[PDB]
Every structure is written in C-alpha cells, then in structure tokens.
C-alpha cells in the first residue's frame, strides 16, 4: 500500500486551516475606558477562537 493521497488531503486541510488561524492572529474617561475594555474583550474572543481552531487542526493531524 501507498500513503500517497491521504497525506495530500491532510496537507491541504491543515494548510487552509493554518491560513485561517493566521487570519485571526492579528465620568467621560470612565466611558472611554469601558470602550477600551470592550475592545480588549473582543480581541480576547478572536484570539481564543484562533487558538481553538489551531488546536482542532492539531487534533485532526493526530486523528
């Protein structure tokens, strides 16, 4: 037997998912800092989504 293709689909899937993960890789003062905290929360959520996606890619490789 030859593992000629299955490696190829694995490469394609993991490369596309790595690219996608890299895509997400990137009293008035009270209100301003509240907006800053909201932006920080948004960045945290986006980066957590990226790391979860990459963990899924690793699990695909392991599977």
């Amino acid at each position: 037997t030859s593992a000629a293709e299955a490696v190829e689909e694995l490469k394609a899937k993991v490369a596309e998912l790595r690219e996608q993960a890299a895509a997400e890789a990137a009293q008035a003062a009270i209100e301003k800092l509240t907006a800053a905290a909201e932006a920080a929360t948004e960045a945290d959520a986006r980066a957590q989504a990226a790391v979860a996606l990459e963990k899924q890619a690793l699990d695909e490789v392991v599977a």
Binding site: T1, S2, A3, V7, L10, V14, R18, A21, A25, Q27, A29, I30, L33, T34, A36, A37, A40, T41, A43, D44, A47, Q48, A50, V51, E54, K55, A57, L58, V61, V62
Partner: protein, 73 residues
C-alpha cells in the same frame, strides 16, 4: 513549552534528513512526516496559547481597573 525538553527535541529534529528519505523509509504509512507535523503543530499551538494567556491577563486587568473606577465614583 519547557526549554530544557524543547532544546533536546530541536536538536533531534534539525538532524532529520530531507523529506525524500522520510518518504522512502516507510512508504506504507509516512510516519516520520506525520510526527514532524505533530511537533510543528504542538509548537505553534503552544505559542498562540501563551499569547492567549498574556492577552487574557491584560483583559482581566482592564476589567479590574474599570471596576475600581466605578467604585471610586
């Protein structure tokens, strides 16, 4: 990642031959290439995870000092 156990794996990793040797070794199931992919994914997931830790600490600080500002008023 722990540097002591990752320097050893980097040393045992860079000494691998080209992909042609690791392909001609076990043509049935390309175990060597897949192990390399696993190592690479572990490294990169760990890097993004430490980035997550830092940014989440920053977010926690933002929540804390926002709460402090609310309490001051």
């Amino acid at each position: 990642r722990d540097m002591a156990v990752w320097g050893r794996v980097r040393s045992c990793y860079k000494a691998a031959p080209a992909a042609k040797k690791l392909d001609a070794e076990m043509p049935n199931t390309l175990f060597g290439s897949v192990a390399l992919m696993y190592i690479k994914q572990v490294r990169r997931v760990a890097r993004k995870a430490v980035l997550q830790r830092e940014l989440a600490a920053k977010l926690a600080k933002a929540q804390q000092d926002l709460a402090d500002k609310q309490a001051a008023l």
